[PDB]
Enzyme design. Structure first.
Site, PDB file in Angstrom:
ATOM      1  N   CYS B 151       0.890  -1.176   0.000  1.00  0.00           N
ATOM      2  CA  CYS B 151       0.000   0.000   0.000  1.00  0.00           C
ATOM      3  C   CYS B 151       0.928   1.226   0.000  1.00  0.00           C
ATOM      4  CB  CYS B 151      -0.998  -0.047   1.135  1.00  0.00           C
ATOM      5  SG  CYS B 151      -0.511  -0.414   2.895  1.00  0.00           S
ATOM      6  N   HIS B 178       0.532   6.064   9.566  1.00  0.00           N
ATOM      7  CA  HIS B 178      -0.373   4.992   9.150  1.00  0.00           C
ATOM      8  C   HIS B 178      -1.360   4.522  10.159  1.00  0.00           C
ATOM      9  CE1 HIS B 178      -1.182   1.091   7.358  1.00  0.00           C
ATOM     10  NE2 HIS B 178      -0.525   1.368   6.297  1.00  0.00           N
TER      11      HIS B 178
END
Lengths: 334, 334, 334, 334
Positions: B151, B178
């Site tokens: 990702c 994150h």
């Protein structure tokens, strides 16, 4: 010893009060605040982040009684009217956040205080001190309205000093992964800053910081070398500085950590700390130093670019700092 | 048209599945998972981050009926036994997180699939691809076990390409703020990473990332020039990459954002997005692009050091990308 | 003095341990757990809820060293093999959550222990004790595998006692607004309970509770009289029991609070506590009592239907209870 | 078709605006707020709880542009000066929470409006209506200043009516497990209620509620029978009502749920919904019904005491009701 006065009994004034408790050289004799003492004693006693105060707290008429000592609580809107001289308050900690321009903070001198400490970034102050970094530059003869800069700047300055002196900073960028503050909104509501208007505990929020530009006030050689921003995240306390600096000397992680470890253990002991443990933000909750290096995060690329991550309890660290500045100033004669 | 089978129907598997409903060229005919079909269908229908799937979902025996299409639910512990080939499955999305080594991932090919897409950074893969960066490099004849990287690598790669091609990167350093993932623990519980062992929703936890170094797989020229770390914060989805890089040409913020905007609007359209609005993390949940430039955050110092901030929904973007590669691979020939 | 062995070092093992540190009359001589001693010393030292343990913790080979004492760590999958007897351990706190059936739990006895405390609801135990409610029913000659009920039953039991005794309970219904547990999922994941499969820090989660029905084990007269559910909420520790009960006698708030208050200061001191302050969940973190009546929330309708709200630190109260029971049991003859 | 104007463009005025969009019989033509048009447009576009508005929004000087239609934005501090009359506003949604007493709210009748809907409990209003329970009681002649009650009353009323009508409620007690609101503080700050001064995203916070007694306004036969409280927990939206009541008839879990399901499907269709799925709070964000019975939680003891648990999107359902109410009033003549 130094009799101290606190203007504004919001988070910072209450945290400073809690910090001073622990100091025998400073004595909080009065606070100024428009909130009813009942509320204020409730708030002093119980904190969601810091827990219950280790002292019996009570209200007597309009005053606060903290372990038997009664704290005069004034409730003046006008600094000018505080009469600090009449109760022998030498030092005033200016934490309302409304008096950050020199002319507004000098009203406490008008009312008799001998020195004013603005617990935040100011305009026209006599000097901005970041303890460990430039307290030596304070002149009792010439400095009466002093700034203790921000929480972020107290974190960054100690270690930018070490890196700069030891290897020389060409330029650098920081990001502060910071907890939400009372400036943000709980749910989306109007705010000056459209980022900060968004439900605080729901998002990662890009925002500004003058911390990087403010390091120049304490280390003038860094003038125009740093820049950075902030990321407010859903934690209520503890934040971290992440500095990427392009150095003049060629280093290794070990050299860098070693220099950071030596300053913490020597010159900066008590201000800068070093940690080789893999801790998370809840572990630094209650920390009193201004910056702890997260030693395992130090990283170097192509021997010149370094990444240094440091932790700060933004409410406790800073608050201990105000009390030390208070103490430092008094030692220079009042 | 292309028939797809998914190994592991956890978050990535359900996420890929969700993305595939939208791509008419793809057709998911089977999923492999040990969980009973009732629970899988409950989990496909209802999701805490993504909301209710827009589709009728039911259970017919041991299978799922999604929009009246029967989905075979296998429950095989070993990839050698999935027998993809009997059912006609061409591509397999390997999302268990367990078969990322060539050794395991290649078993599906033994079972009859023509190709395997590992939905994670792999080991000994034929090639690692970032859609928008090096899909050009795919060879249908020689590359059969493909990696979709992560990702975070899909986020950085596309804007590192532009920077690198316009002004050339000397060295850079990143941090990804994150959202917590399933790899972390709810309360302090054992874990291989002592950082990831702590209550995920209570802290700011520094952790490592291979996303920086992995850019070198897709952009060979950046080999040994990027490094980074991650900080998981108390948000359930949506992340942000913060890149600090030393460029070769002296540039402006305007020049830096016009290169990125140009890219976003031209070549990288669909992959790279450009935003001039003061948005926050919750605003990107459901965003299908790989990287969205937070144009208001671009910074430069000394004309050579730049700071770029890019948003990404780590679960939605990556998923769309997986389906993009599936559709891309199939388009070259099976 | 009383030598204790801990089976399983997860959150309950670790908290019971931490609790025991404050009783000079208990001595943990050994723990049994399969995680590495490096991972257990780390998790003993730092807690996201409970903070840093104030005790020097180190690893000595395979063992822990805490404050001078060396704790033997075992790594037996089978209680049969624990040899409690040879290290002189008398009471085993069984807190794995795997041996709650008398027969499994009895394996610690075969290996040398004299008694077993199951820190959770058990099946076929000799007796189930809520300290302050029925420890007097404990029989040293007949009771060897004892249950300490659950955290929630320890909260409810003490004041259902008092309420029943004074006014008499006809029927009652409880709801516990409970903190997420290690039993829930970080992100939507398969779980037996479809409600507990959802992202714990993102929703209000209705779930089941044995708590209410288990009071009957300690107060036989409430058999068939109480019922209840749980709602898990996004906090990591501290919970609250809400009881709505139909009484046989006519009462007032003042009546019910005074009774509650009398028992807390009298018979239930240290188990039941009473508070007339407007506190919130965070203020009860660290609390050792089993139940704290939120006095400002008592409410009456038609003189017969009362609402009583009581707090519990579901990790600490409960850990102090296991420690107390070990000491009660030792004290009756081993 | 009916022209509505909103006073106060905070969360409720904005939520009413978003709901209105869908209703084709209503037309908001003007909003009154002191916030600049820029922030307002930003706040209507993106919402941390509801997502991006599916509408194009812009600013035409001081006004808003929503799908081509320019919405006039006034900015008067005093309702009398809003001149509703000249723009043709027949109905005014009073959502500031400053003009809740009749006498204040009647100032909008003076500026030319025909009816005022107070989107909050009111004082001395012509009538308090809970849509689906007593709207038949509305008289176009007699009622000009009407209260839509609160989100919580709107959730309880529809199902209390059913239970009572069918089983006859003797006495009852509720708990609303509620989302934090804009009324709470992010970090400990002063507030009139000392519970609500406490960091909102960090605790379970007990506080009062009038929804329980507020029900007699709508169901007079329950006058003096219900009381209740609130628990504010760490979520941004979606709440649940927990009702424990003593019935007049002996019942079964099964009869209770059938009555509700029967209500749900006919009479209360659109207000009360019925669910047999094991869902969580997130699953209800965006729900436009007032009450959603969580069938799996219904519980009975002694055939007499029951537990009913209903879900409500406190910002979405309430807003749709105001819109519904605005359309009903209007259908009776203006």
């Amino acid at each position: 010893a130094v009799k101290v006065g606190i203007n504004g009994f919001g988070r910072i004034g209450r945290n400073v009060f809690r910090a001073a408790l622990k100091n025998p050289d400073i004595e909080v004799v009065a606070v100024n605040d428009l909130t009813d003492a009942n509320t204020l004693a409730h708030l002093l006693k119980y904190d969601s982040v810091h827990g219950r105060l280790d002292a019996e707290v009570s209200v007597n008429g309009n005053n606060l009684v903290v372990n038997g000592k009664e704290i005069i609580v004034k409730a003046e809107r006008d600094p000018e009217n505080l009469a600090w001289g009449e109760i022998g308050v030498d030092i005033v900690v200016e934490s309302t956040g409304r008096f950050t321009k020199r002319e507004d903070a000098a009203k406490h001198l008008e009312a008799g205080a001998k020195k004013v400490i603005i617990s935040a970034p100011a305009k026209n102050e006599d000097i901005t001190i970041v303890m460990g970094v430039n307290q030596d530059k304070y002149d009792p003869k010439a400095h009466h309205v002093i700034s203790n800069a921000s929480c972020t700047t107290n974190c960054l300055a100690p270690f930018a000093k070490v890196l700069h002196e030891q290897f020389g900073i060409v330029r650098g960028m920081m990001t502060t992964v910071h907890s939400y503050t009372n400036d943000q909104r709980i749910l989306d509501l109007p705010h000056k800053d459209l980022r900060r208007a968004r439900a605080a505990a729901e998002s990662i929020i890009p925002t500004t910081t003058g911390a990087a530009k403010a390091v120049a006030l304490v280390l003038p050689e860094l003038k125009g070398k740093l820049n950075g921003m902030a990321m407010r995240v859903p934690t209520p306390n503890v934040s971290v500085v992440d500095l990427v600096a392009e150095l003049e000397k060629e280093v290794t992680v070990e050299e860098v950590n070693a220099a950071l470890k030596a300053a913490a253990e020597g010159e900066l002991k008590g201000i800068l700390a070093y940690s080789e443990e893999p801790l998370v933000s809840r572990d630094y909750n209650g920390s009193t130093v201004s910056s702890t290096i997260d030693a395992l995060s130090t990283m170097v690329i192509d021997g010149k670019m370094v990444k240094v991550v440091s932790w700060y309890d933004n409410e406790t660290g800073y608050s201990h700092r105000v009390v030390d500045l208070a103490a430092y100033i008094a030692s220079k004669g009042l």
